Design a protein around this ligand. Structure first.
Ligand code: HEM
Ligand SMILES: [Cl-]
Length: 153
């Protein structure tokens, strides 16, 4: 369970993300695909992209990044009260997309890397600690939902 103080560090850096969601979504998805190329294979819509340049030029990938970060933003703004938001996300990711928890760990790493790179004014050690705790909470609750849904994750 995060403290209010931890949530405020989380929401303070997220406020900067929100200056340019699309840009942050591109950086995060590209970082994920570069660091863990197996994750790209889960995306039938994107798995043809061969290079970072093709990824940067992909209008569709940018749209998807906005969709992803906006969903995560809405979860973070619930400050742990995210049962309603997690139900559809867990169901699609377990049953349609088949995304293991390991891959959620990978995108968590990508989010942290990008925030660390772009936002050193709002992402020092304590802020990164808080964001890690929020993402761990997200993954813990998603894992529990996966198990309820019948997906071992
Ligand atoms: C913070 C973690 C994540 C969030 C908030 C997130 C959010 C979303 C959202 C909102 C959608 C659109 C609606 C839906 O199908 O549920 C989506 C689609 C999808 N997600 Fe995620 N996602 C996350 C992590 C991942 C990861 C790590 C992968 C793969 C390694 C993944 C693979 C997909 C795929 C394949 C789709 C369908 C894309 C398409 O063809 O339209 N997700 N995700
Ligand atoms: Cl800090």
């Amino acid at each position: 369970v995060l403290s209010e103080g931890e949530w405020q560090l989380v929401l303070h850096v997220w406020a900067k993300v929100e200056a340019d969601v699309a840009g942050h979504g591109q950086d995060i998805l590209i970082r994920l695909f570069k660091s863990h190329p197996e994750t790209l294979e889960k995306f039938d819509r994107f798995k043809h992209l061969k290079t970072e340049a093709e990824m940067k030029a992909s209008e569709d990938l940018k749209k998807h990044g906005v969709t992803v970060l906006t969903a995560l933003g809405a979860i973070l703004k619930k400050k742990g009260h995210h049962e309603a938001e997690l139900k559809p996300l867990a169901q699609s990711h377990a049953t349609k997309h088949k995304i293991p928890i390991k891959y959620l760990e990978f995108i968590s790493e990508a989010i942290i890397h990008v925030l660390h790179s772009r936002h050193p004014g709002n992402f020092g050690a304590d802020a990164q600690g808080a964001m890690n705790k929020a993402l761990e909470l997200f993954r813990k609750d998603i894992a529990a939902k996966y198990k309820e849904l019948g997906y071992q994750g």
